[PDB]
Design a protein around this ligand. Structure first.
Ligand code: HDD
Ligand code: HEB
Ligand code: HEB
Lengths: 30, 330, 432
C-alpha cells in the first residue's frame, strides 16, 4: 500500500518543492 | 443493448457536432484562401489566423471524442472498420497533419503564412471527401454486394454514383453551412459577396445536396432496400430539413436577423444528417456489426456516456462563450 | 507474409509515429507547469521579467501543442487500424481513459486559449495565474489518463475471458491497475524534468552567446533548480517503478539487467554487451540496489529471466536503454545539482562555457532519455500481449499497404519535425 501510493506522493512533493524554489532562492535571494 | 443504441445515437451527434465546426473551418480555410490568393497579405493572414485556428482545434475534439467513443460501445467495429479502412485514414491524417502543421507554423511564420495556403486550398476540401469515403463505405460494402455477398475489389469501389453523392452531400453543404455561419455575423458593408456565394451554395444545397439525399434513395433501391425503406420512413425528416433550408433561404433573401437562419440551418442539416443516420440504424454496415453484436460490459457504457456529457458540456459552452466574448452584450 | 510482415511493419510505423508524438508532448506536459511557476514567481516577486518568460514560452508552447495534436490524431487513428483484434477485445476497457486524456487536454486548452487571449485584454496577473493553474493540471491529467492505458496494457484486470471474448469490465480496476501509480508518477516526473532542462537549454544557449543576463540568467537559475528537483523525484519514482517491476514483471527488469539467473544479492549493470545469443563482452556491474533500501533486505531474491519462458521473454537489447535512460538521469541530475550549487551559490561558474554547453545539451539529453525509457518500458512488453491479452502476431492486418503508408508517414513526420524546429527557432530569434 505504502509503496503503491508513495510515487504520486513523491511527485506531489517535487511539484511544491519546485514551487518553493521560487520563494526560497529566487524571491529573497540571487 | 439500449445503451448501445443511445451511445451511437449521441456519437452520431458528435460526428454532427464535428460537421458543424468543421464546415465553418474548412469553408473558411479555403474561401479565405481564394479571397486572399489575390493579395497574400500577412497582416490579413495574421489577423485572420489569430482566431481561425481555435475552431480547428475544437473540431478535432469532436472528431476524436467520436472516434474514441464509438469503439467503447463497439470494439467489433475496431476489428472490422479498423481492419478494412486501412488507407483513407492515413490520407485524412496526412491532410490533417498538413492543416495543423501550417496552422501552427503560420502563427509565427510569414513565409508559410502566404505560400502554404495552397495546402489549405488542397486539404480544406480534400478532407471532407476523405471522411466521406468512410461515411460512404459505412453504408456500402468491402465483401458486401448484391445477390448474396460477392467479394469486392476495394480499388474500384472508389468510382461510384453513390460515393460522389456523399461527396456532394458533404462538400457543397460544407460550403453552404460555412457561408451561412459567415453571413450570420457578417457585420460589414462588404457582406454582399458572402450572401451571393451563400445563395450559390444554397442552390447547391437545394440541388446537389438534397439531390444526393435522393441519389442515395435511388441508389439504395438497387443496393440496400432495408436502408431505402428506413430512409422513406424518415424522408419526412428530409422534408422538415428542406423546409428549414427554405427558412434559412428566406432569411437569406430577406432580413438581417440570421440567428433564425443559423437555427433553421442547424435543425435543417441536423435532421438531414440525423435521418441519414437513423435510417442506417440500428446497425453498422455488417450484420455482424449490428449494435448488439459482441455484447460489451455496459457500466463503462454509462461511464463513457458520462464522458460524452462532460465533453459536450465543454464543447458547446466553449462556443456559446466564444459567441459572448465577441459580444459582451448578454 | 501477406498477414505477418505487418506484425513487424506496424510495430515499426507506430514507433515512428509515437516517437515523434512524444517530442511534442512531454513538453506539453512539463512546460505549462514551468510557465505557471514562472508567472507565480513573477507575481510573488513583482518581477515582470518572469511574467515575460511565461508568455515567451507559451508563444512556442502553442506550436509544440499543435504538432503534438496532429501526431496525436495520427497515433489515435493508427491504433485500431494497425491493431484491430487488440481493440476488438480491449477497446471496451481502453475507450474511456483515452477519451479522458483528450478531454483533459480540451479542458486545459480552453484556459490556455483564455490566458493566451485575455492576458492582452483583461485585468491583473493573479487572474492569469488562476488561468494557468488549470492548464498544467489538465496536462498532467492527460498523462494520468492516457498512461493508465499503458499501465493497463502492461497489467490486467477489470475483465473476464469468455473463450477469448473480453467482458465483465470494471472501469477503475483496469484504470487503477498495479502499474498505474509508477507509470503516472515516473511519466509526470520525467516530463516536468525534461521540459525543465529544455528551458535551461534555451537560457544556457541565449546566455552563452548574446549574454543578455536580463532574462537569461534568471531563466537558468530557476529552470536548473526546478530541473534538479524533478530529476531527483524522477529518479526516486524510477527506483519505485524498478521495484514494481522486480515484484510484478521481472521479465522486463531481468532483460534490462540481464539476470538470467535467479539470486538473492544480484548485481546491477552499468553497461555491457551481450549479443542476443550469450556473448558477454564489456562487463561493468555493481552489487544490487532494488532490495537493500527498496525491499529493506539486500538478499531479496530477484526473479531470473531463465525462469521466464523464452516465448514470454523480451529481447536483451533492452539493457542498453536502461543504461542510456538511467545514466542520462544521474549525469543530468549531477549537472543540475552543480549548476545552482557550485556555479551560483559558490564559485560563480555560471558565465563559464563549461556549464552553458552542458546546459545546452541538457534538454536534448532528457528527451533522448525519454525516447530511450519508452523504448525500454514498451519493448519489455511485446511478448506478454500475445498471452493474457491476445497474440501480437494476430493483432495486425495486411502488408503491401503498411510498407508504403509507413514511408509516407515517415516523410510526413520528417517534414513536421524539421519545419517545427525551424519555425520554433525563428520565433526565438525574432525575440518576442
Ligand atoms: C520503439 C519503441 C516502441 C515500440 C516497438 C512500440 N511503442 Fe508504444 N510507445 C513507445 C515506444 C514503442 C513510444 C513511442 O516511445 C511511446 C509513445 C507514447 C509514449 O509516451 O511512449 C509508447 C507508448 C505507448 C502507449 C502509451 C499510452 C500512454 O501512456 O498514454 C501506448 C498505448 C502504446 N505505446 C502502444 C503501442 C502498441 C499497441 C505497440 C505495438 C507493438 C507499440 N506501442 C510499440
Ligand atoms: C504522457 C505523454 C502522452 C502520451 C503518452 C500520449 C499517448 C497517446 N495520445 Fe496524446 N497528447 C499529449 C501527451 C501524450 N499523449 C499531449 C500533451 C497533448 C496536447 C497537445 C500536445 O501533444 O502537445 C495530446 C493530444 C492528443 C490528441 C489530440 C486530441 C485533440 O485534438 O482534441 C490525440 C488525438 C491523442 C492520441 C494519443 C494516443 C492514441 C496515444 C497512445 C495511447 N493525443
Ligand atoms: C526522461 C528522464 C528519465 C529518467 C531520468 C529516468 C531515470 C530512472 N528510471 Fe526511467 N523512464 C523514462 C524516462 C526517464 N527515466 C521513461 C520515458 C520511461 C517509459 C515510460 C514509463 O515510465 O514506463 C521509463 C521507464 C522506466 C522503468 C520501467 C517502468 C515500467 O515498465 O513499468 C523503469 C524500471 C525505470 C527506472 C529508472 C531509474 C531507476 C532511474 C534512475 C535514474 N524507468
Amino acid at each position: 500500500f505504502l509503496i503503491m501510493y508513495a510515487p504520486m506522493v513523491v511527485v506531489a512533493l517535487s511539484v511544491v518543492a519546485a514551487f518553493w524554489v521560487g520563494l526560497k532562492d529566487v524571491h529573497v535571494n540571487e | 443493448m439500449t445503451l448501445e443504441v443511445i451511445g451511437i445515437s449521441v456519437l452520431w451527434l458528435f460526428l454532427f457536432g464535428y460537421i458543424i465546426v468543421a464546415s465553418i473551418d474548412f469553408g473558411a480555410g479555403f474561401f479565405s484562401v481564394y479571397s486572399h490568393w489575390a493579395n497574400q497579405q500577412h497582416i490579413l493572414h495574421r489577423i485572420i489566423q489569430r482566431y481561425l485556428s481555435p475552431v480547428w482545434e475544437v473540431t478535432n475534439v469532436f472528431l476524436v471524442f467520436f472516434f474514441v467513443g464509438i469503439v467503447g460501445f463497439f470494439p467489433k467495429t475496431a476489428y472490422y472498420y479498423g481492419s478494412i479502412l486501412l488507407v483513407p485514414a492515413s490520407i485524412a491524417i496526412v491532410l490533417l497533419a498538413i492543416r495543423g502543421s501550417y496552422y501552427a507554423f503560420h502563427t509565427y511564420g510569414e513565409t508559410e503564412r502566404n505560400w502554404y495556403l495552397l495546402a489549405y486550398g488542397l486539404t480544406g476540401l480534400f478532407i471532407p471527401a476523405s471522411l466521406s469515403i468512410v461515411l460512404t463505405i459505412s453504408e456500402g460494402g468491402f465483401v458486401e454486394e448484391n445477390a448474396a455477398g460477392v467479394a469486392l475489389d476495394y480499388g474500384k469501389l472508389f468510382a461510384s454514383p453513390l460515393s460522389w453523392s456523399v461527396v456532394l452531400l458533404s462538400v457543397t453543404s460544407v460550403l453552404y453551412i460555412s457561408a451561412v455561419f459567415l453571413t450570420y455575423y457578417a457585420d460589414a458593408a462588404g457582406d454582399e459577396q458572402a450572401r451571393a456565394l451563400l445563395r450559390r451554395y444554397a442552390l447547391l444545397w437545394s440541388g446537389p445536396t438534397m439531390l444526393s439525399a435522393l441519389l442515395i434513395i435511388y441508389q439504395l433501391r438497387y443496393h440496400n432496400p432495408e436502408h431505402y425503406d428506413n430512409l422513406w420512413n424518415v424522408a419526412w425528416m428530409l422534408v422538415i430539413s428542406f423546409l428549414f433550408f427554405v427558412i434559412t433561404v428566406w432569411l437569406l433573401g430577406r432580413q438581417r436577423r440570421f440567428g433564425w437562419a443559423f437555427i433553421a440551418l442547424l435543425f435543417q442539416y441536423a435532421f438531414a444528417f440525423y435521418a441519414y443516420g437513423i435510417s442506417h440504424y440500428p446497425y453498422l454496415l455488417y450484420p455482424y456489426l449490428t449494435i448488439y453484436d459482441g455484447f460489451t460490459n455496459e457500466t463503462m457504457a454509462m461511464a463513457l456516456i458520462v464522458a460524452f456529457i462532460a465533453g459536450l458540456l465543454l464543447l458547446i459552452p466553449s462556443l456559446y462563450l466564444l459567441m459572448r466574448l465577441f459580444l459582451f452584450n448578454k | 507474409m501477406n498477414g505477418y510482415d505487418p506484425v513487424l511493419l506496424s510495430r515499426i510505423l507506430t514507433e515512428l509515429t509515437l516517437t515523434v508524438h512524444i517530442i511534442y508532448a512531454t513538453i506539453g506536459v512539463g512546460v505549462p507547469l514551468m510557465i505557471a511557476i514562472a508567472q507565480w514567481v513573477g507575481i510573488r516577486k513583482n518581477d515582470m521579467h518572469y511574467i515575460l518568460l511565461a508568455r515567451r514560452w507559451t508563444r512556442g508552447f502553442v506550436i509544440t501543442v499543435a504538432v503534438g495534436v496532429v501526431t496525436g490524431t495520427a497515433i489515435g487513428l493508427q491504433l485500431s487500424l494497425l491493431w484491430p483484434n487488440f481493440m476488438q477485445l480491449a477497446g471496451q476497457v481502453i475507450s474511456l481513459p483515452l477519451f479522458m486524456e483528450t478531454f483533459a487536454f480540451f479542458f486545459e486548452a480552453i484556459f490556455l486559449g483564455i490566458y493566451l487571449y485575455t492576458w492582452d485584454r483583461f485585468e491583473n496577473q493573479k487572474k492569469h495565474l488562476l488561468l494557468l493553474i488549470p492548464v498544467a493540471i489538465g496536462s498532467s491529467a492527460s498523462a494520468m489518463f492516457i498512461t493508465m492505458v499503458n499501465a493497463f496494457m502492461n497489467t490486467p484486470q477489470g475483465f473476464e475471458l469468455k473463450n477469448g471474448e473480453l467482458v465483465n469490465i470494471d472501469p477503475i480496476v483496469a484504470m487503477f491497475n498495479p502499474a498505474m501509480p509508477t507509470k503516472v508518477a515516473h511519466v509526470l516526473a520525467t516530463s516536468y524534468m525534461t521540459s525543465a532542462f529544455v528551458l535551461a537549454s534555451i537560457a544556457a544557449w541565449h546566455l552563452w552567446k548574446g549574454n543578455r543576463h536580463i532574462y537569461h540568467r534568471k531563466a537558468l537559475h530557476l529552470t536548473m533548480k526546478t530541473a534538479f528537483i524533478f530529476s531527483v523525484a524522477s529518479a526516486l519514482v524510477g527506483d519505485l517503478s524498478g521495484k514494481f517491476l522486480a515484484e510484478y514483471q521481472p521479465e522486463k527488469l531481468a532483460a534490462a539487467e540481464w539476470h538470467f539467473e535467479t539470486s538473492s544479492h544480484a548485481p546491477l549493470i552499468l553497461f555491457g554487451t551481450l549479443e542476443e545469443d550469450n556473448e558477454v563482452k564489456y562487463a561493468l556491474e555493481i552489487p544490487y540496489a532494488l532490495s537493500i533500501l527498496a525491499h529493506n533486505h539486500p538478499a531479496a531474491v530477484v526473479t531470473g529471466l531463465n525462469d521466464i519462458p523464452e516465448d514470454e521473454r523480451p529481447p536483451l537489447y533492452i539493457h542498453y536503454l536502461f543504461d542510456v535512460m538511467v545514466t542520462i538521469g544521474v549525469f543530468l541530475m549531477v549537472v543540475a545539482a552543480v549548476y545552482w550549487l557550485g556555479s551560483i551559490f559558490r564559485w560563480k561558474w555560471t558565465a563559464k562555457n563549461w556549464f552553458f554547453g552542458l546546459l545546452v545539451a541538457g534538454g536534448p539529453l532528457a528527451m533522448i532519455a525519454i525516447e530511450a525509457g519508452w523504448y525500454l518500458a514498451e519493448v519489455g512488453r511485446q511478448p506478454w500481449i500475445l498471452r493474457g491479452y491476445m497474440k501480437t502476431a494476430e493483432g495486425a492486418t495486411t502488408s503491401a499497404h503498411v510498407d508504403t503508408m509507413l514511408v509516407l508517414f515517415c516523410l510526413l513526420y520528417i517534414v513536421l519535425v524539421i519545419a517545427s524546429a525551424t519555425v520554433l527557432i525563428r520565433m526565438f530569434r525574432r525575440n518576442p
